[PDB]
Design a protein around this ligand. Structure first.
Ligand SMILES: [Cl-]
Ligand SMILES: [Cl-]
Ligand SMILES: [Cl-]
Ligand SMILES: [Cl-]
Lengths: 131, 131, 131
């Protein structure tokens, strides 16, 4: 029949349009599959960056721990030096005052020795004059 | 003719069902393309975040490097101070002994001069008596 | 006859298109699984960046404490050094004053011995003139 042949031909056409659509979707899918492989490789490149940064942070963490310890060692050394310098300031104050006292005492002894030298002359001259 | 007509309608229905299913698959693919765009935008935000993290790690590294150098300089300055304080301990210990010796010697000279002073008085009184 | 054959060809073509549709459906399901895994990897990456920044901030605070300690130690060594320089100078002046005292006391020692001998010489002489 005429109506039957016409519908059959419309179905042939519609099956062709559905196959065009299937071909288009297959290409969209293939391209997406390929693009996800590149995204996975972009993730790998970022993973590589993070491994290098983490390695640098761990190296810095070790350096900070060494420096915390070195600072503690320097602190023990300056802790120890300071009282030794305080003690030298005390000993030098002590010696300065004792040196000034010696210089006064030697000066007094020098003048007293000159007075006794003069006295021996005075008295010997006097006694000699009486003889 | 009858069987043909019935199968032609089954084909009309099956072609329409295939089209509806193809349209549903197209919408699933559009959703995946949207998921891909979001993933790419997350990766781009991570790249941008890495500019700040790299900058911060480098700033930290440089601060640690400066501190390592400061510790080295301070250690050299304490290494230089220590033997100077050891030297001053020696210098002041030897000066202390020389100051104590001078104090004993000046004390002895003072008492020896007092002995001679009285000897002069005694001998002059004696000689005066004989004249 | 021709119509009957074309209708069965359409049945065959619809069945082939349905195999392809079912295959594409499964390929889309697989791609959806790949996307879910990528989203999980992004979540892990996001936290790996948060973990690095957390560690860098913590380390920065430890470094700040060490920079502070270094400044403190630097203030202490800056203060100690001029005190040691001063002790070198003061002890050098005290040494010169001690050497001068030793020469002066030595001289007064010899002079006092000479005056002791002079008193003996002169008393013997005066006794000789009287007796
Ligand atoms: Cl290391
Ligand atoms: Cl972050
Ligand atoms: Cl950071
Ligand atoms: Cl006489």
């Amino acid at each position: 029949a005429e109506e039957i042949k016409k519908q059959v031909q419309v179905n042939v056409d519609d099956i062709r349009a559905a196959n065009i659509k299937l071909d288009g979707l297959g290409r969209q899918i293939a391209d997406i599959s390929n693009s996800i492989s590149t995204i996975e490789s972009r993730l790998g490149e970022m993973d590589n960056r993070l491994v290098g940064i983490s390695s640098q942070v761990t190296q810095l963490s070790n350096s900070v721990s060494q420096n915390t310890q070195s600072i503690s060692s320097l602190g023990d050394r300056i802790n120890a030096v300071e009282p030794r310098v305080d003690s030298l300031d005390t000993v030098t104050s002590n010696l300065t005052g004792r040196t000034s006292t010696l210089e006064a005492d030697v000066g007094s002894l020098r003048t007293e020795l000159a007075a006794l030298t003069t006295r021996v002359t005075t008295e010997v001259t006097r006694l000699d004059g009486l003889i």
